[PDB]
Amino acid sequence: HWGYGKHNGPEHWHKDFPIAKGERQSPVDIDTHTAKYDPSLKPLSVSYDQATSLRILNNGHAFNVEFDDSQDKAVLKGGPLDGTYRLIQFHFHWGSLDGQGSEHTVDKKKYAAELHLVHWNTKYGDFGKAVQQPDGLAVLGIFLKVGSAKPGLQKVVDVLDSIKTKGKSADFTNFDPRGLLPESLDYWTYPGSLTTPPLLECVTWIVLKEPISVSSEQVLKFRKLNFNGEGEPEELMVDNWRPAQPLKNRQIKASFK
Ligand SMILES: NS(=O)(=O)c1ccc(NC(=S)N[C@H]2CCN(c3cccc([N+](=O)[O-])n3)C2)cc1
Numbered sequence: 001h002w003g004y005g006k007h008n009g010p011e012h013w014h015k016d017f018p019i020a021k022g023e024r025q026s027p028v029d030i031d032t033h034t035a036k037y038d039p040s041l042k043p044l045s046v047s048y049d050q051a052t053s054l055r056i057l058n059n060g061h062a063f064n065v066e067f068d069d070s071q072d073k074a075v076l077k078g079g080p081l082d083g084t085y086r087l088i089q090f091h092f093h094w095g096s097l098d099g100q101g102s103e104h105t106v107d108k109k110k111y112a113a114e115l116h117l118v119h120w121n122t123k124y125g126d127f128g129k130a131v132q133q134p135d136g137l138a139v140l141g142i143f144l145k146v147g148s149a150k151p152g153l154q155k156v157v158d159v160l161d162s163i164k165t166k167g168k169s170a171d172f173t174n175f176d177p178r179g180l181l182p183e184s185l186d187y188w189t190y191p192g193s194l195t196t197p198p199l200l201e202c203v204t205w206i207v208l209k210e211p212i213s214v215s216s217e218q219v220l221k222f223r224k225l226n227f228n229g230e231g232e233p234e235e236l237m238v239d240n241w242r243p244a245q246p247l248k249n250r251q252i253k254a255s256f257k
Pocket residue numbers: 066067088089116118127139193194195196
């Protein structure tokens with residue numbers, strides 16, 4: 001019964017998921033002055049032209065846009081990664097107000113929201129096997145700030161009224177995730193974890209430096225979703241973010257000088 005409420009939030013997760021206090025937990029604060037430029041990193045390769053979106057689901061914690069990952073259609077390669085990672089889903093974390101919502105922070109700055117594009121390593125054959133491995137997932141993280149509308153986000157915003165409550169889904173075909181990227185693919189990278197239970201330490205994090213701009217109207221529609229199921233007391237889906245975790249014995253590397 002984990003969540004983001006007064007009594008089941010991140011400070012409680014360690015009781016059911018002791019890895020919550022582990023050596024490679026996410027998210028983290030990115031100290032821009034201590035992150036080292038690594039000239040040996042490669043440009044990231046984001047190959048989304050053949051992406052097949054299928055469905056959008058309110059899972060009670062966020063909403064997931066789900067992809068066909070039954071073959072190598074939408075893949076992330078290069079940068080810090082060895083081999084090929086298949087896009088399985090994306091989701092967001094956001095705040096009750098614009099001054100909070102991101103999971104990663106940049107010099108302790110909180111963004112209004114953060115997009116996670118989740119990919120799994122095809123050398124492990126399926127997602128459930130990949131999450132048992134230290135290099136099993138690659139998550140591309142993109143900050144959202146409030147300003148101009150993001151045109152590529154509006155198809156997502158406009159379906160949210162149809163998946164208001166936990167367990168609701170809707171058909172969501174032909175959505176192009178390239179419309180969610182910023183101009184620059186400059187990034188920071190570090191080894192971490194899932195940011196929700198079960199908090200598995202299986203993620204190569206790749207966090208873009210350049211945020212995307214969304215409008216106030218767009219993020220207000222995220223904040224009208226519900227954590228609760230249909231006919232249950234209304235609990236607005238806001239502040240579904242985990243705060244920064246200790247960095248411990250880890251180095252954040254920058255792709256840019
Ligand atoms: N915040 S975060 O980015 O650290 C992060 C947190 C949690 C997850 N959990 C994920 S992607 N869980 C999996 C379990 C299986 N799974 C599938 C599998 C096949 C098809 C679908 N589907 O519904 O289309 N979903 C989703 C990953 C990433």
